[PDB]
Structures are given as structure tokens and as C-alpha cells.
Design a protein around this nucleic acid. Structure first.
Length: 173
RNA sequence: CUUAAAGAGUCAACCCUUUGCUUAUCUUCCCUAUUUAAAUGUUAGCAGCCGCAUAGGCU
């Protein structure tokens, strides 16, 4: 693990639980919110042109950190400060508002500008929960186009694409 | 003051060749239709032409 984490910090080195990369690939906005991360929550991963080194079985950094709270046992801190501090040096905040939706909300006596950006856990728990447990009403999408590995490593890993729900009500006869 | 802002999805096609549905069969017995109505409304133009008839008249 140490050599490819060192390769990651020598690379671009960004981990995130929230992004706008899924809305448009020209996003480059990245924030790791802290209080929403629970034991089964999942996190995606970006480095430039989705590069990396395998762990001698074709295994990159993602399923490593994703597999059953692997990240948690370094985040809670039972693996020592030596790995935990180098992990914490990667989760930085990167701000960008270009080519993103920018909407308003009525707050108390006034309006507030805010940018909707996507969630990390929702896509991966969607691919692993509407699929395995027999929900038979969904749309399968692939982002991006013929080269989907431009966004993230989550984008890179599965090429079947994520799943949304159908929002089609039954209609009047 | 909207996941606000925005975008050509276009094209082409031989499905088709062949076929034994056959063999019989008990529907079957019993019954109160019935009793009283205004056809209202025809109050609708016909054998007709005296008639350029699509304007106006007479038996």
C-alpha cells in the first residue's frame, strides 16, 4: 500500500466524497465533507488521466480503499499515524464553479446562490444495491462517452455505468 | 430568478422453406308472462303554374 500511496501523492493526489465531475467532465471541483462519512460510505478517486500502478493482481487503489471499510481502519486510526497522516495530506479542497448548475434558494428574507454538486456514495451504492437485490425499475447510464476514464477512477473501473431510478408515473388511459 | 445556461443521432436490410387433427358420443327432463295504457306532436305546402322560376298570385 505504501508505494502506491507514495505514487499517488507524487501524482495529482485527490480523494473526495463530493464532486461536480459527474455533471460535466470539465469540472475540477473537489471537496471531502467530513461529518457525512459513515461506516458503509464509499469514496471515489481522481488522478490525472486516471493513472496508477497495480498491486500485482491488476488491482488499483480503489477497490483497495473501497473494499468493506478498508478506509475506515485508516481513517479512525488503528493503523498508526504513519499511514494516517499521509492519507490526510491527500484529502484537500479544490474549488471550481465553471460549467456547473448555479441555482438559488429562498432563505430567511432573501435569496442564496448555491451550486449543486454530486455525491460519491450514491453512485457506488446504486451500482451495488439496485443491482444485487432485485429492483427491476432503473436506467443504466455510462459517463462519459467512448472514453469514460477521464472523470475519475470510479469512472475508470466499471464501464457498465451507474443506475438511476425511473421517474415515469402511470398515465391516464 | 428552476442540476438555471445548451446542443440534428443519421443511415441499410428477402425470414422462409414443409406439414393428415383424427377417432367416437342421448341434453333432459316442467313451467299462467301480465295488467292498462290518447300515438301525442300530423297545426307538416300539394294536382298545379298566374309566374326567370331563387320576388310576388289563384282554384
Amino acid at each position: 500500500i505504501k508505494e502506491m500511496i507514495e505514487d499517488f501523492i507524487s501524482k495529482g493526489g485527490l480523494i473526495f466524497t463530493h464532486s461536480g465531475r459527474y455533471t460535466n467532465t470539465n469540472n475540477s471541483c473537489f471537496i471531502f465533507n467530513k461529518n457525512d462519512i459513515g461506516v458503509d460510505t464509499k469514496v471515489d478517486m481522481y488522478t490525472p488521466k486516471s493513472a496508477g500502478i497495480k498491486n500485482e493482481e491488476g488491482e488499483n487503489l480503489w477497490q483497495v480503499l473501497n473494499k468493506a471499510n478498508m478506509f475506515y481502519r485508516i481513517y479512525s486510526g488503528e493503523l498508526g499515524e504513519e499511514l494516517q497522516y499521509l492519507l490526510k495530506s491527500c484529502c484537500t479542497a479544490k474549488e471550481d464553479v465553471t460549467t456547473l448548475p448555479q441555482i438559488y434558494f429562498k432563505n430567511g428574507e432573501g435569496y442564496d446562490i448555491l451550486v449543486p454538486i454530486g455525491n460519491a456514495h450514491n453512485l457506488i451504492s446504486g451500482t451495488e444495491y439496485l443491482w444485487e437485490h432485485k429492483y427491476y425499475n432503473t436506467f443504466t447510464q455510462k459517463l462519459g462517452g467512448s472514453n469514460p476514464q477521464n472523470c475519475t477512477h470510479a469512472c475508470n473501473k466499471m464501464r457498465g455505468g451507474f443506475k438511476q431510478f425511473n421517474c415515469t408515473p402511470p398515465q391516464v388511459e
